[PDB]
Amino acid sequence: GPLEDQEENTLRELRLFLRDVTKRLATDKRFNIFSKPVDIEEVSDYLEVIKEPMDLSTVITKIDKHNYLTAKDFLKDIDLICSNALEYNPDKDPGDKIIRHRACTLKDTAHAIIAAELDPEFNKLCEEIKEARIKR
């Protein structure tokens, strides 16, 4: 009915918005290491250290599978990408500092894009849609 139709429109443009944001992050060359899942040959112990891996391609997949009801849930997976890089790469060799700084840069960039371009009242409507669906 009308309620369900208005709900789907809201989420449709949320997905269009998040899909545009995720594309702007993957094409940024600084974040290329986060745009695809890791190759285990490069990091054979990665799945023993990182219990919940995440990347930008997987984020796109979850956008299309309708897994995100809010922009905050989208940012939780961006934050997961960053905290995983901080957990797997310790503050030691010079290469470690590079990827750790790129991870925090990726996290700050994504939060700043959402904060500048997402209407707060559109966002609150998404938050209300999610809470209604979780408890119904």
**Which residues would be at the binding site for ligand YD4 (CB under 6 A)?**
33, 38-39, 42-43, 85, 88-89, 93, 95-96, 98-99
Kindly tell me which of 39 and 64 has the beta carbon lying closer to ligand YD4: 39
Kindly tell me which of 90 and 120 has the beta carbon lying closer to ligand YD4: 90
Euclidean distance between CA atoms 68 and 59, whole angstroms:
9
Q: Which two tokens stand for residue 94?
A: 């010079």
Least distance CB 49 / ligand YD4 (angstroms): 9
Based on the number of CB atoms within 10 Å of its own CB, is 71 exposed (0-12), middle (13-18) or buried (19 or more)? buried
Q: Which two tokens stand for residue 86?
A: 């901080």
Least distance CB 93 / ligand YD4 (angstroms): 5
